[PDB]
């Protein structure tokens, strides 16, 4: 798409994406966290 | 000129902190089995300082486009000289950086440290450093003005004498970061350990007004770069010639139409307005 | 599965070599682990690779570039964009509030539930273009240099809040060589300590206690360098009227 | 094509060879690789480009 | 064997080893000094660079002593390659065409780079920026290409 | 044919033993602040330490060998050295070698006056570990246990036993 | 702010211990209304509605907090939401017509 | 009450400092609206 502030068109892009070689001896990077579960989906009308 | 070395690696060898504990913890690289009070009061003097005339020069970062300034050059403890990969220079006004990094390439954060020390935050565009632990004399304003004018370009120096604290507001955030890293633990005309942190938001409502006005000035500058100058004139409407162009172009023929702003300024290749 | 990175953060080469690492970093905004995309830059700078720093969820919720964390519509920092056009959105930054908010927005967006600011910046430019006994003039004793050559400091009178030291120092630097320049907007005062006595004398003879700096009239004379204390409100008021009455 | 310097450029293999020649005497002396120690010893690919 | 034998079990080296033993010991002591070098003032890959440099130099001494200026018998050359005075795989690459000056096998190992590339030190310096001083992370080579 | 994956492919080579030696000497005890970015992997390789113990102890030298060289697979941190070998033997030859050890050991135990058993543990608890380069690297090894074979009777295995 | 943080902490400690207690939710929201934190009281009422979606007493408390503090449009939005949620509860319909 | 008295005396006699009782493992309910649930938009405007 255009730019932040520029609306001039610019060149089409070919991206080469490779998965990174990670060190096999590494443990996982980040400590896990306790987050309260989020609110439910908006409750439906009570059809009594 | 080439970048000169500031000190020598014979005293930039890497070695432990002095022993303040029973046993050295090799994971955290810290002494253990000691106390907590020692750490709180211990804040030593800086081991060096840098000079624009004497030390600042050229390096492989002046060769390489789009690199960062040298933090150890800012601290005056860079023995690398011309072989450093980071710029040995004060930033100018044309040296801008993205919010995610600072002038030294260190990542900025969503928050502040609770003592307002460190790299800084991208959640506040802070250009104001807070210099405490100043020896209270009468020439303190002159000394602060001289040293921080040596360290960069200033929009506002506000030095309090009661607690000996200088709030310095540079006009470039990179200048503020360089000044904080170059003035932390250094000394003015007296031998003192300066506590140079990031200043908090000013509770003075004049300063609040001027900071907010600068926010809208920067944002409107971005808007006017984004929009064509003719949409700018038509929307601004400070002059009657662009005002009457606004009525005619919004009329599009019919009298008394006054086209919606969305239709009239909807930019695109072929939307409505020939200004697009 | 593809980053939202802007064209200035992307390399100049149209053919991009990216590395992708699942759970590569913490998001700077929500502190959750996200897939990092990183690319080697343009100039073989030492540094690192330029990488995505926030998650795609935070980039969509703040309309930001995922590397530079700047607004995708104008090129502003997100805080500046939302402060000036504040009617877009707030955001939470307390600890578990921010992970909770990000997890709820991401779950909502992914399971389906949940261009907008033209009016906002049109209004911003409308607002920003909505704009915001008599003391004697200086005399021959005021523009004549005193015989005391130890007095080096010039004294500037009547400083508005929006008068900055960089242009003040540039003006006095293209005149002479400055040792120091103290400006207090709180008391509308300034002291100038020059380096050359001859340069200070010739500059003050050029200006004669009168100076036009950026549309602000300033009265410059000679005075002993004095610490600017906590002056009276009447003192700074009369100081301001003296600066205004420098020009008749 | 984008990344190498001298993109495009009508330039033949012979003048490849002279460009490499001028660059190879801009580089310093590799050494002899039958003298183990002292002056004249082999440095090979670790030879500095003189600037 | 290249495992150390007692003394009575030790078999003598071939002929010419008395002639080249001084240069071989020069390389060996150079390698021990590289082991004893300090690492505080330099980075970590830079700490490993001199081993690769000296290994290249020792193998080049053996290689050009046999192939270019013929001064050792084939029996002695095979014995040196077997007993660890020279790197047979590096010498094999030096025999290959377009690899006559390779710094190290890790620099042509393409399975171990991010985009399956060789290192930048193998690129003819004619295609790089002027005053772009390359010193590769693997061995610190400033240019290996045979044209270079 | 040489670029059937986009690039020129080559076999993985062996490095110099001095490279691995320099890596372990530099990291030492992991005490200098330089090696934090290695600390997470080093400790992570603890998960794989049982393989290293098995590979080393199965490739241990036999009593008739003074020293043995083994191929090792090492991490570039200096965190994990894995003996990448299988101690493959010709079973008749291995039988004959250990039978000759049985006979040689019995002769030596009948002929020794006093057998001083070596101490366990061989080193002190607080004594720092020895160095290859400064304590073992070029040191002359003692004689291994070897039968005196016969130039005529044991002629068929004499050179290589 | 010190006192308000202390009270907010004790209120949310009781919500974590027993979220099923309407009085826990009710006293928290009434205290924020007394502090004139209408966004905070609204948020408490909505989290209470997440726990008790079909509770007539809770819907009435929220609607009445808006009406008492003269947020008529907020209150009419709540009244539409409530008679959508509970269309056979004649109390909510009677409150809306009244 | 005693700590409040001491803090008021310090604030009266000049020095202002942030006595922060914020523990390890506690949210800042003053800092932010916790688990904020905004009222659903309806057919009536509520901006005023
Ligand atoms: Zn995020
Ligand atoms: Zn970007
Ligand atoms: Zn190499
Ligand atoms: Zn290389
Ligand atoms: Zn190379």
mmCIF file with all atom_site columns, N, CA, C and O and ligand atoms in Angstrom, chain A residues 4, chain B residues 98, chain C residues 5-6 8-9 65-70, ligand 2:
data_model
loop_
_atom_site.group_PDB
_atom_site.id
_atom_site.type_symbol
_atom_site.label_atom_id
_atom_site.label_alt_id
_atom_site.label_comp_id
_atom_site.label_asym_id
_atom_site.label_entity_id
_atom_site.label_seq_id
_atom_site.pdbx_PDB_ins_code
_atom_site.Cartn_x
_atom_site.Cartn_y
_atom_site.Cartn_z
_atom_site.occupancy
_atom_site.B_iso_or_equiv
_atom_site.pdbx_formal_charge
_atom_site.auth_seq_id
_atom_site.auth_comp_id
_atom_site.auth_asym_id
_atom_site.auth_atom_id
_atom_site.pdbx_PDB_model_num
ATOM   1  N  N   . UNK A 1 4  ? 3.323  5.638  5.158  1.00 0.00 ? 4  UNK A N   1
ATOM   2  C  CA  . UNK A 1 4  ? 2.733  6.471  6.192  1.00 0.00 ? 4  UNK A CA  1
ATOM   3  C  C   . UNK A 1 4  ? 2.185  7.749  5.574  1.00 0.00 ? 4  UNK A C   1
ATOM   4  O  O   . UNK A 1 4  ? 0.971  7.923  5.476  1.00 0.00 ? 4  UNK A O   1
ATOM   5  N  N   . UNK B 2 98 ? 13.708 6.704  15.275 1.00 0.00 ? 98 UNK B N   1
ATOM   6  C  CA  . UNK B 2 98 ? 12.378 6.163  15.444 1.00 0.00 ? 98 UNK B CA  1
ATOM   7  C  C   . UNK B 2 98 ? 12.077 5.994  16.932 1.00 0.00 ? 98 UNK B C   1
ATOM   8  O  O   . UNK B 2 98 ? 12.989 5.986  17.757 1.00 0.00 ? 98 UNK B O   1
ATOM   9  N  N   . UNK C 3 5  ? 5.052  -4.250 8.079  1.00 0.00 ? 5  UNK C N   1
ATOM   10 C  CA  . UNK C 3 5  ? 6.206  -3.371 8.172  1.00 0.00 ? 5  UNK C CA  1
ATOM   11 C  C   . UNK C 3 5  ? 6.151  -2.377 7.026  1.00 0.00 ? 5  UNK C C   1
ATOM   12 O  O   . UNK C 3 5  ? 5.834  -2.742 5.890  1.00 0.00 ? 5  UNK C O   1
ATOM   13 N  N   . UNK C 3 6  ? 6.441  -1.119 7.329  1.00 0.00 ? 6  UNK C N   1
ATOM   14 C  CA  . UNK C 3 6  ? 6.358  -0.064 6.337  1.00 0.00 ? 6  UNK C CA  1
ATOM   15 C  C   . UNK C 3 6  ? 7.577  -0.067 5.423  1.00 0.00 ? 6  UNK C C   1
ATOM   16 O  O   . UNK C 3 6  ? 8.592  -0.710 5.693  1.00 0.00 ? 6  UNK C O   1
ATOM   17 N  N   . UNK C 3 8  ? 9.780  2.212  4.590  1.00 0.00 ? 8  UNK C N   1
ATOM   18 C  CA  . UNK C 3 8  ? 11.049 2.790  5.003  1.00 0.00 ? 8  UNK C CA  1
ATOM   19 C  C   . UNK C 3 8  ? 11.784 1.889  5.979  1.00 0.00 ? 8  UNK C C   1
ATOM   20 O  O   . UNK C 3 8  ? 13.017 1.915  6.031  1.00 0.00 ? 8  UNK C O   1
ATOM   21 N  N   . UNK C 3 9  ? 11.052 1.101  6.762  1.00 0.00 ? 9  UNK C N   1
ATOM   22 C  CA  . UNK C 3 9  ? 11.685 0.094  7.600  1.00 0.00 ? 9  UNK C CA  1
ATOM   23 C  C   . UNK C 3 9  ? 12.125 -1.115 6.784  1.00 0.00 ? 9  UNK C C   1
ATOM   24 O  O   . UNK C 3 9  ? 13.104 -1.775 7.141  1.00 0.00 ? 9  UNK C O   1
ATOM   25 N  N   . UNK C 3 65 ? 3.241  0.734  12.497 1.00 0.00 ? 65 UNK C N   1
ATOM   26 C  CA  . UNK C 3 65 ? 4.201  -0.146 11.857 1.00 0.00 ? 65 UNK C CA  1
ATOM   27 C  C   . UNK C 3 65 ? 4.797  -1.067 12.901 1.00 0.00 ? 65 UNK C C   1
ATOM   28 O  O   . UNK C 3 65 ? 5.003  -0.690 14.053 1.00 0.00 ? 65 UNK C O   1
ATOM   29 N  N   . UNK C 3 66 ? 5.080  -2.285 12.485 1.00 0.00 ? 66 UNK C N   1
ATOM   30 C  CA  . UNK C 3 66 ? 5.447  -3.302 13.444 1.00 0.00 ? 66 UNK C CA  1
ATOM   31 C  C   . UNK C 3 66 ? 6.921  -3.236 13.824 1.00 0.00 ? 66 UNK C C   1
ATOM   32 O  O   . UNK C 3 66 ? 7.301  -3.776 14.863 1.00 0.00 ? 66 UNK C O   1
ATOM   33 N  N   . UNK C 3 67 ? 7.738  -2.515 13.055 1.00 0.00 ? 67 UNK C N   1
ATOM   34 C  CA  . UNK C 3 67 ? 9.126  -2.246 13.418 1.00 0.00 ? 67 UNK C CA  1
ATOM   35 C  C   . UNK C 3 67 ? 9.295  -0.900 14.118 1.00 0.00 ? 67 UNK C C   1
ATOM   36 O  O   . UNK C 3 67 ? 9.765  -0.842 15.255 1.00 0.00 ? 67 UNK C O   1
ATOM   37 N  N   . UNK C 3 68 ? 8.925  0.189  13.449 1.00 0.00 ? 68 UNK C N   1
ATOM   38 C  CA  . UNK C 3 68 ? 9.214  1.536  13.928 1.00 0.00 ? 68 UNK C CA  1
ATOM   39 C  C   . UNK C 3 68 ? 8.256  2.009  15.006 1.00 0.00 ? 68 UNK C C   1
ATOM   40 O  O   . UNK C 3 68 ? 8.587  2.957  15.724 1.00 0.00 ? 68 UNK C O   1
ATOM   41 N  N   . UNK C 3 69 ? 7.110  1.344  15.144 1.00 0.00 ? 69 UNK C N   1
ATOM   42 C  CA  . UNK C 3 69 ? 6.012  1.681  16.045 1.00 0.00 ? 69 UNK C CA  1
ATOM   43 C  C   . UNK C 3 69 ? 5.615  3.127  15.737 1.00 0.00 ? 69 UNK C C   1
ATOM   44 O  O   . UNK C 3 69 ? 5.528  3.982  16.622 1.00 0.00 ? 69 UNK C O   1
ATOM   45 N  N   . UNK C 3 70 ? 5.428  3.433  14.459 1.00 0.00 ? 70 UNK C N   1
ATOM   46 C  CA  . UNK C 3 70 ? 4.857  4.713  14.084 1.00 0.00 ? 70 UNK C CA  1
ATOM   47 C  C   . UNK C 3 70 ? 3.539  4.497  13.359 1.00 0.00 ? 70 UNK C C   1
ATOM   48 O  O   . UNK C 3 70 ? 3.299  3.446  12.764 1.00 0.00 ? 70 UNK C O   1
HETATM 49 ZN ZN1 . LIG I 4 .  ? 8.278  1.116  10.027 1.00 0.00 ? 2  LIG I ZN1 1
#
